[PDB]
Amino acid sequence: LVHVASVEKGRSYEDFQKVYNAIALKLREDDEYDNYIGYGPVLVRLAWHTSGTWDKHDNTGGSYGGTYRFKKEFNDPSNAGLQNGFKFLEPIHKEFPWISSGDLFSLGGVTAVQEMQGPKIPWRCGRVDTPEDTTPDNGRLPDADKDADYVRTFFQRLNMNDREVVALMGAHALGKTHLKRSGYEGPWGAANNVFTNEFYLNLLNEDWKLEKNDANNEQWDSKSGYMMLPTDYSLIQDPKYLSIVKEYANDQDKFFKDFSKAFEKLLENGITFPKDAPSPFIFKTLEEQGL
Ligand code: HEM
């Protein structure tokens, strides 16, 4: 199965900047969500989980088909809580019914990262909705109770290498774990709706204790009130990951650049872009537009 990007008919960068802007304005307006964290983090996670079902071996799953809109995928236990991101995007989709579902879920993530003062993420249009029977089964998203070997093997299926994995994991600066959702509870740091390299700094610099949470799962906790999942912590247990963690803890620009590449890549696995497709779009933030 080849998934060829097909530009929404007649649309160009300005159309997608309008969708960006509507997402960004709603992010600003709907600020109460999740104890005033706002929707940025869950939109980033929605973009990732709608992309992260991809299997490089047969091109099943991935962002192209926008299959989260079907019940098998929106009810995946791994996706618990993402319905909030979907509901956020619903009025956006109503205003801009021409955008494909995959384009909207992925654009939500881009918009969230950028509006949270993260790197620019080039974004390409052209995902096309595919039918219900193309929805990938549950079980393709990763478990959090595992070690570095698990993480490394997991991400090979998404064609991500060590650097790409460690970079992508930096998104765990954002938002928080919610016990009733994942069986883990707590934020990873203080700046959880501003995109920074804090995840790496906290991994290296906090004093972590292995504790059990109220769902009886182990997680790493600090006196500052932060947590790390076992898979997060694996990034400093594994010496290869550790080197990269230290790199990003010590160079914010490098983290931004590597995250941007890896996140675009994640959002684009599985999609074939024709030679004459538009170049990737770099959207202006609301701030850059004076909006
Ligand atoms: C080994 C890989 C990963 C595992 C096991 C993992 C696991 C988790 C878990 C258990 C949660 C908490 C869900 C909840 O209780 O609300 C979470 C939240 C989150 N994850 Fe991941 N994650 C991984 C990779 C990633 C990647 C690659 C990204 C995106 C680049 C990402 C972005 C997020 C965000 C932004 C949140 C916060 C969501 C919110 O506040 O609503 N994660 N992750």
Side-chain angles (χ1 to χ4, degrees):
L1 59 196
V2 177
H3 289 320
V4 183
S6 188
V7 174
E8 293 83 340
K9 188 160 180 49
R11 302 286 167 184
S12 63
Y13 171 78
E14 162 216 271
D15 297 278
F16 295 101
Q17 179 78 71
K18 290 177 179 165
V19 177
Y20 177 106
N21 283 357
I23 295 165
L25 289 161
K26 191 183 178 55
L27 268 175
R28 178 193 280 175
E29 172 68 31
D30 288 2
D31 64 330
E32 65 299 309
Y33 172 71
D34 213 349
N35 289 297
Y36 283 90
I37 294 165
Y39 284 92
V42 75
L43 290 178
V44 174
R45 203 195 194 209
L46 179 64
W48 140 239
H49 270 205
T50 54
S51 304
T53 59
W54 187 58
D55 189 336
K56 67 181 177 180
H57 299 99
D58 59 8
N59 203 15
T60 53
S63 76
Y64 186 82
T67 50
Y68 179 84
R69 67 192 196 277
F70 295 117
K71 72 183 102 83
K72 176 172 76 176
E73 180 169 353
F74 64 64
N75 288 327
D76 182 352
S78 305
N79 284 339
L82 289 185
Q83 301 97 326
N84 292 282
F86 186 85
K87 279 214 206 225
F88 175 98
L89 292 173
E90 280 184 331
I92 310 297
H93 217 165
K94 190 179 180 162
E95 178 170 3
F96 303 96
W98 50 265
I99 192 168
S100 69
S101 286
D103 277 1
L104 183 59
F105 305 147
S106 61
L107 183 55
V110 168
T111 303
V113 169
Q114 298 195 175
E115 293 293 306
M116 292 193 289
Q117 293 177 335
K120 289 307 186 72
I121 317 293
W123 180 88
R124 303 182 88 157
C125 69
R127 300 165 186 78
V128 179
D129 292 2
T130 56
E132 191 154 17
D133 68 359
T134 64
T135 305
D137 290 340
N138 299 353
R140 293 172 174 225
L141 295 164
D143 299 332
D145 66 331
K146 307 285 206 284
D147 64 9
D149 295 330
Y150 171 83
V151 170
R152 180 167 288 115
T153 293
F154 175 84
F155 270 107
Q156 282 169 183
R157 197 199 71 224
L158 295 174
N159 191 34
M160 302 290 180
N161 68 15
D162 281 7
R163 289 182 64 90
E164 290 169 323
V165 167
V166 176
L168 285 168
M169 216 76 73
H172 279 176
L174 305 170
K176 66 187 294 288
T177 66
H178 312 77
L179 202 76
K180 283 209 222 201
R181 284 185 192 171
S182 63
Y184 296 99
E185 168 69 35
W188 292 270
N192 66 160
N193 57 18
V194 177
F195 197 96
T196 75
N197 67 159
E198 192 181 356
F199 170 83
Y200 310 101
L201 288 160
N202 286 356
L203 267 173
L204 296 171
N205 297 149
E206 295 287 301
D207 299 331
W208 301 108
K209 289 208 169 188
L210 181 64
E211 295 181 335
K212 271 198 167 165
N213 65 34
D214 289 353
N216 201 216
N217 301 315
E218 292 193 312
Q219 52 179 72
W220 292 92
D221 296 330
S222 77
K223 312 164 236 288
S224 311
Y226 313 147
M227 63 85 67
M228 296 278 156
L229 300 159
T231 43
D232 297 318
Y233 199 79
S234 85
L235 301 189
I236 59 172
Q237 296 173 313
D238 178 277
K240 301 187 202 93
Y241 282 157
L242 176 62
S243 292
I244 306 165
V245 170
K246 292 176 183 173
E247 297 184 29
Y248 293 147
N250 286 280
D251 190 336
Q252 297 175 105
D253 183 59
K254 182 61 170 150
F255 168 53
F256 269 35
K257 288 183 314 165
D258 285 355
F259 182 86
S260 176
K261 296 193 275 178
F263 194 62
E264 178 175 13
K265 176 174 165 177
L266 176 77
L267 273 46
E268 291 173 1
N269 296 132
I271 308 173
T272 299
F273 295 94
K275 116 205 242 269
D276 54 349
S279 301
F281 303 134
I282 303 177
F283 299 115
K284 307 295 197 285
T285 61
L286 295 180
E287 184 169 71
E288 278 172 335
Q289 292 171 91
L291 300 170

